[PDB]
Design a protein around this nucleic acid. Structure first.
Ligand SMILES: Nc1ncnc2c1ncn2[C@H]1C[C@H](O)[C@@H](COP(=O)(O)OP(=O)(O)OP(=O)(O)O)O1
Ligand SMILES: [Mg+2]
Ligand SMILES: [Mg+2]
Ligand SMILES: [Mn+2]
Length: 758
DNA sequence: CTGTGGCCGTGGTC
DNA sequence: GACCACGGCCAC
């Protein structure tokens, strides 16, 4: 099983290294035969003579074209002649490429920015993570001495916990009478002890939660301060701090550093992303949090250190368990993209598509288009029309069926062959004409991307089957995640068409797909309402809620199933409308915002404050009980009672601070805020106190009593003291709770005045 | 930073 | 007050 590739340099020449685990044995395979290259398109092949003489000087050594050879390839399906330019070292490519491209006789150059080790994986047809090979895994975590306002890594590490299938232990340098703690003499010894555990357990995978940004950087800092070599790689090396825009990523050569945070952040929708919060959401159970001041208080006194050691040990065990649960998803993705697990688990979905496309293109002999330059970027800024959203019938509706297209946009792309290599192509024999926008797509031969989406849909269907059959709830949720991930990947191929930085960019494709989406959903609505007696209550892009007014439950279900048997045979190719759900009661507040209740009493909520991270819990909690009182009890006067009790509770300061907190992400550098809302305001004041804020920081705040701008009244959550200053009960009633519930109770004739406390 | 459609609170213009 | 960009997050 191939884990990774890289290259090192020996004698000025590149040597590729393949990291493999075969029959339980770790191997490093060396390939010295592989030659970096890119392609050049010429006005005429006589100019190759002059092009071959281009040189660059890098670090006082002349760089030259090692060898040129004329190759036949295809570009968007069409034949094309290019010159393959080989070189002696990968670094030769960035050094010479601009000067090759600037040559008068060179129309353009191609595939000049593919990393050499990944070029090797693609060109050699190697897929990481294939095989029954069993990998070993080890998680670790750290607990550190912390005081507000000190530089990173100033305080010593106090404990390094670690966990795998067998044990879960804490190394520390103070005496903790617990059975999983190993006390050693010094911090330096604690670390050197951790180093040996890893070397001797020899894990294939190293699992952390935010290790890319916290744990490994702290360890590196302590190692420098204590004079330790931080030897974790299987080749003896220290961890390699790669860079990835605003964040960092940490490699550990020969092993897979599996950092959970990017995957969890991508998969689970939480207001905050503490390890406790993530653990709770995946496994159901709570995790106690001990705090940096608690930790430091215990350490400087000797007392209460066993709560800290337990907390440390649970971090590792929980990290390991999260690691075990999500690893199969990342492995399969690794196989589907054809890149390392280390990459795919940190990759944007754009780069995942790009890397999948590059690999398939090599197998098809399709020269890849280039990422756009700044001028092509600017001519791609135009938008295009998206999906049809129907304004919902409002009020309370009974016996609601939900009908929804399977994998709609991918299914359109495949059925109508929507690809840049088939758009207005040649003199073709059959085409499909997109409605409204008119683009013609050749049907004589399969388009590049259309020919590839099918298998992604099968893979999802296969996982979906496994999911619907699985009874163990934990395994069913993880399987829900995997099938959602493959669905988002497949839809990302559609979005890629309209992605400005995309290689195989194609706005006509993108807008042809949406336009077909609109035609199909509107045809279904019209057939439902004008010929089968349904009232469509709501509809979005490719799904719709519908009922037969006045009919009983079993009539709606029977007529809905009848309609599907009628419509699906008139649908072309993979277009298929699915029976997706039935609800005894539902009500629709606005576009994107509704709630429905199934026959078992499960309320499904979409879009409403309940589901958002950035409303306070007290608003979300009240809306949930209102929703239950209406949808499950039909008792609207109880809903009202609920609201008035919560408004009276806020007025009397009887709601705890935690339900008052608001969570809002900083998405960009503070300097770049054209408008400064409350969360930004709080952020800027922390930034002024020397507190690192970066895109992805989640700000937690409460607004205090007062008036004026709300950002003027707002404070970090951790800093609210109910004794010293009281919270803005007025704010939470009129700006949080009442807008959340009145958008529902409006439909029953309640005005805000009916919900407040006198 | 895969796409567009959309709700909604905040606070900057008059 | 009206007007209305900006920003955040959600439904597809
Ligand atoms: N994250 C996304 N990125 C891009 N396009 C999206 C995304 N989510 C939804 N869309 C588009 C493409 C989908 O075909 C269409 C309708 O969404 P949806 O019904 O949720 O998915 P789907 O039809 O592909 O899968 P499913 O079989 O679960 O219904 O909206
Ligand atoms: Mg569906
Ligand atoms: Mg849908
Ligand atoms: Mn669908």
């Amino acid at each position: 099983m191939i884990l990774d590739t890289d290259y090192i340099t020996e004698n000025g020449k590149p040597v590729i290294r393949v990291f493999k685990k075969e029959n339980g044995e770790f191997k490093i395979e060396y390939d010295r035969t592989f030659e970096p290259y890119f392609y050049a398109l010429l006005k005429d092949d006589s100019a190759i003579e002059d092009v071959k003489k281009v040189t660059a000087k890098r670090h006082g050594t002349v760089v030259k074209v090692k060898r040129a050879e004329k190759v036949q390839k295809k570009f968007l399906g069409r034949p094309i002649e290019v010159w393959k330019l080989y070189f002696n070292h990968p670094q030769d490519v960035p050094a010479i490429r601009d000067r090759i491209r600037a040559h008068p006789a060179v129309v353009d150059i191609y595939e000049y920015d593919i990393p050499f080790a990944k070029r090797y994986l693609i060109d050699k047809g190697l897929i990481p993570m294939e095989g029954d090979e069993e990998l070993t895994m080890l998680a670790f975590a750290i607990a550190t001495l912390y005081h507000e306002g000190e530089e990173f890594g100033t305080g010593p590490i106090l404990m390094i916990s670690y966990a795998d299938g067998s044990e879960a232990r804490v190394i520390t340098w103070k005496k903790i009478d617990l059975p999983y703690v190993d006390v050693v003499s010094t911090e330096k010894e604690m670390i050197k002890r951790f180093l040996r555990v890893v070397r001797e357990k020899d894990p294939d995978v190293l699992i952390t939660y935010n290790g890319d940004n916290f744990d490994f950087a702290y360890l590196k800092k302590r190692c420098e301060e204590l004079g330790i070599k931080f030897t974790l790689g299987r080749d003896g090396s220290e961890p390699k701090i790669q860079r990835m825009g605003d964040r960092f990523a940490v490699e550990v050569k020969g092993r897979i550093h599996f950092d959970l945070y990017p995957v969890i952040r991508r998969t689970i929708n939480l207001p905050t992303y503490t390890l406790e919060a993530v653990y709770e959401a995946v496994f159901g159970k709570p995790k106690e949090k001990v705090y940096a001041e608690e930790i430091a208080q215990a350490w400087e006194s000797g007392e209460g250190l066993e709560r800290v050691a337990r907390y440390s040990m649970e971090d590792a065990k929980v990290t390991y368990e999260l690691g075990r649960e999500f690893f199969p998803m990342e492995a399969q993705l690794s196989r589907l993209i054809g890149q390392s697990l280390w990459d795919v688990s940190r990759s944007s979905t754009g780069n995942l598509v790009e890397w999948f496309l590059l690999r398939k293109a090599y197998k098809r002999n399709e020269l890849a288009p280039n990422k756009p330059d700044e001028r092509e970027l600017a001519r791609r800024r135009g938008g295009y029309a998206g999906g049809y959203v129907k304004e919902p019938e409002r009020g309370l509706w009974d016996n609601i069926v939900y009908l929804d297209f399977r994998s709609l946009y991918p299914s359109i792309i495949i059925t109508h062959n929507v690809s840049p290599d088939t758009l207005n192509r040649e003199g073709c024999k059959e085409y499909d004409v997109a409605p409204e926008v008119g683009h013609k797509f050749c049907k004589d031969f399969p388009g590049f991307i259309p020919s590839l989406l099918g298998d992604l849909l099968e893979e999802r269907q296969k996982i979906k089957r496994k999911m619907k059959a699985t009874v163990d709830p934990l395994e069913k949720k993880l399987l829900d995640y995997r099938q959602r991930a493959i669905k988002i990947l497949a839809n990302s191929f559609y979005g890629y068409y309209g992605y400005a930085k995309a290689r195989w960019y194609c706005k006509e494709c993108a807008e042809s797909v949406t336009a077909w989406g609109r035609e199909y959903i509107e045809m279904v609505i019209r057939e439902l309402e004008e010929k089968f007696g349904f009232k469509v209550l709501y509809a979005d892009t490719d799904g719709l809620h519908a009922t037969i007014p006045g009919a009983d439950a079993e009539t709606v279900k029977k007529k809905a199933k009848e309609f599907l048997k009628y419509i699906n045979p008139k649908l072309p190719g993979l277009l298929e409308l699915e029976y997706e759900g039935f609800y005894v009661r539902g009500f629709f507040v606005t576009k994107k915002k509704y709630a429905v209740i199934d026959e078992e009493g499960k309320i499904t909520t979409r879009g409403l404050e309940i589901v958002r991270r950035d409303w306070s819990e007290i608003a979300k909690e009240t809306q949930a009980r209102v929703l239950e009182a209406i949808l499950k009890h039909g008792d609207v006067e109880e809903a009202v009672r609920i609201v008035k009790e919560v408004t009276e509770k806020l007025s009397k300061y009887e709601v705890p601070p935690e339900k008052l907190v608001i969570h809002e992400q900083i998405t960009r550098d503070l300097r770049d805020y054209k408008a400064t809302g409350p969360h930004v305001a709080v952020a800027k004041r922390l930034a002024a106190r020397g507190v690192k804020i970066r895109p992805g920081t989640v700000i937690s705040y409460i607004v205090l009593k007062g008036s004026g701008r709300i950002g003027d009244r707002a404070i970090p959550a951790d800093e609210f003291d109910p004794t010293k200053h009281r919270y803005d009960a007025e704010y939470y009633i009129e700006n949080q709770v009442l807008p959340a519930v009145e958008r529902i109770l409006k439909a029953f004739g309640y005005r805000k005045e009916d919900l407040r406390y006198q």
